[PDB]
Symmetry: D5
Subunit: 91 residues, 10 copies
Amino acid sequence: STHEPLEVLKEETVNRHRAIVSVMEALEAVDWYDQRVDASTDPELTAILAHNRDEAKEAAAMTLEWLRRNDAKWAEHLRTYLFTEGPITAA
Amino acid sequence: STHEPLEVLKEETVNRHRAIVSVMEALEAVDWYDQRVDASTDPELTAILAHNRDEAKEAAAMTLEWLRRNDAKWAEHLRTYLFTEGPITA
Amino acid sequence: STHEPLEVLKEETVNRHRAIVSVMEALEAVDWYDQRVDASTDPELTAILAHNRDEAKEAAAMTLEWLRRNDAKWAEHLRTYLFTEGPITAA
Amino acid sequence: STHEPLEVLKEETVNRHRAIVSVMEALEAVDWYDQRVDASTDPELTAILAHNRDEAKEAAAMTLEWLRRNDAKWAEHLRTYLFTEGPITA
Amino acid sequence: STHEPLEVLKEETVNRHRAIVSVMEALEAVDWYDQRVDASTDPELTAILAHNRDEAKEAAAMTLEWLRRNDAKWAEHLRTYLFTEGPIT
Amino acid sequence: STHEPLEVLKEETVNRHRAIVSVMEALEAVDWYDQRVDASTDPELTAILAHNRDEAKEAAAMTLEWLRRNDAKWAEHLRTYLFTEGPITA
Amino acid sequence: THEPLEVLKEETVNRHRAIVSVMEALEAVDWYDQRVDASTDPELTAILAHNRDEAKEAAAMTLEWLRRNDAKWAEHLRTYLFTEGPIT
Amino acid sequence: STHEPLEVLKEETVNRHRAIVSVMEALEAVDWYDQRVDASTDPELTAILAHNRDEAKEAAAMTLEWLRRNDAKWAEHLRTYLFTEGPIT
Amino acid sequence: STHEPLEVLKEETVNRHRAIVSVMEALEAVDWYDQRVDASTDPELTAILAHNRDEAKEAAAMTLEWLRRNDAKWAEHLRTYLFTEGPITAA
Amino acid sequence: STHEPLEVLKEETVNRHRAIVSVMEALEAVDWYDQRVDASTDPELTAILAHNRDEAKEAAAMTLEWLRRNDAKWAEHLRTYLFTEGPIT
Ligand SMILES: [Mg+2]
Ligand SMILES: [Mg+2]
Ligand SMILES: [Mg+2]
Ligand SMILES: [Mg+2]
Ligand SMILES: [Mg+2]
Ligand SMILES: [Mg+2]
Ligand SMILES: [Mg+2]
Ligand SMILES: [Mg+2]
Ligand SMILES: [Mg+2]
Ligand SMILES: [Mg+2]
């Protein structure tokens, strides 16, 4: 699934890759479930879709914390920006 | 861009969509840049690639903070897990 | 996201479409998560990936039950094969 | 057809992959067949598509049972939710 | 799902489009199921896959018969080649 | 181009794969050529496209006869439905 | 298409139909020829090679249409086709 | 990037592959550039896009001549249809 | 061919979109042509491919100057980095 | 990520490939961000997207200069067209 061959990649690069694409897929799941939540005309499907939407938000948060713990620059930038107030582009 | 038609989606949903896919695109850029840094055999090229890799992390972090501010569940789950100690799943 | 234009589709069909593709995406995440579980050389990431692997299984299951309650043939074929013994083709 | 290389994947993980993508492809055919059932303006084609739609639902059902027999968590979660009454998220 | 817009296409063309992509999708499933039959190391799964493989051939054949009945050239060319002997060439 | 690796596939499975995808690609060209015939506003182009469309039906028909000859269930299922009368779903 | 139809000229849309018909024919020639090399069944190989060459013919016809209906295709095809010596 | 694996392909087949897909990629750029010429509302961009549109036409033609020189059936079929008069079919 | 619907885009934006993806496609032809130049074992074909590779570079160049003339930040950032000496990151 | 296999590619060709695709990916980021700048109905988000849009223009510029230093024909053609006035063609 990696774009470069595995023998030229440091083991750590490959685990960050596995974590990053797991976040990507959770995010995409959040977006698509929410869109189906707005568009659904069956209220029982909608509760299911919204529950799993929020489970996918959780999966993303866990895996982002791993990246933060395992990457110095994710650590610095996430601290710079998450849980702040005032203009985001100026933090 | 969207999966469902724009006319049945709430304004807020569509703005969050724009933020989510931007984080996705920055995440993917992080991954691909970093793999290229490992594999690059030109150190001037490697330096560019590694610099822009970290600019993409910042772009991701900015947009995720936006999601955090505009979505109750993004705020709750990011607060449960980010900047913690001990087993993440716990 | 539908193949045929929305105006020629019955509302129920579009609701089942939303359900089916949601199961498809959940299945896919189960598969991709589990493969990363085998391949991860970081045990912290592996635990995160396995936890979310199994939440994706739950989302699949909830949404198939919705399909079952809202489709006569899903109800029939699921009843025939799930929770059986002996050769599956022989049920 | 796998994301990770075959050599680091347990044999069962690869057979479960084969089952999951087969279920995925069956589901997609159900969906597309049903949409074409609604849209076809030739009632003969419509009968074919509806018949094969349901064969495809059956193929998904068979393979899902295989998953349930070969994965403790599929078995638990399918036991929690299928053939129940009342709110699915409860 | 069509390439040209629906307002400029004849209705029969659009039904034939529905039949054709149904055949393609069944064919693709035949191929992919059969490859998994070869590669599967769990024989209970292999049996499921081979049963579904062959149900997919049946869906293709039915829908190819619909095309044959609803398209003169499908009828001509399928008549020339199917169930013949000697070099297909 | 095979979903599974070549070393685990039987040679005849791989040749049927080569035949099957050739039929698919010919089928696709029938559909796309026929759609362009309906939509074209140049009658010379229209005549080219309808000519090649029907050539594509021929390549499919040829390769489907090969499949019939080389796969027991293609033979059985094709012999059940082609050149029949009355409701197909029987 | 790329752009929406309402901003496109009708000459451009017909050329598009011709161009992608050539592209698809070209792609079929390639994939057929690769399967000709790879096939270990000679009756299939004969079929695949036969249809390969029909696809070259479908491409050639449609290219003549582009030539007759596009001034620069007519110019560039005339410059290079059926020549000898360095193509550059 | 090839359909079949490289180890079972002739180098001739693979060089013709390189030529065919290069023509395909040029053909697409001609189409997409021309569509952008129609759609552009800036006359300078439009002028750039049209020039590069026509460079792509040239690249297809050169590479198509190589195919003619290296493939007996390319040679026969191109010589039947290019630069002719009357019904192409 | 736009991610967002045309009716919400500024006309100058869609034109810049048209120029950007044209650069992208020319860049891609340069890369793929060059790889075919290295790998090709026929020099007539390699010469053809090498000629068109460089024509594609020129197409990228022309189109990027249009972007430069119609977007201040393209103009600024391109003015900082192109035709410089010494470490590219430090300009 | 290459179309041809790495073993037949010169080391520098692969490096230029890495640089080219990096520019390509930046370019796409500029476009999609800018379209969302126009379309967003939340001004805080728009500010983020406009900032990141312009960071991506910068990455493209950096990486484009690297190409200019490592490819004689990029150097010639970039020399010809960038920072000029008058008809580009
Ligand atoms: Mg949870
Ligand atoms: Mg906790
Ligand atoms: Mg259903
Ligand atoms: Mg749950
Ligand atoms: Mg059955
Ligand atoms: Mg049956
Ligand atoms: Mg013929
Ligand atoms: Mg012919
Ligand atoms: Mg020229
Ligand atoms: Mg030039």
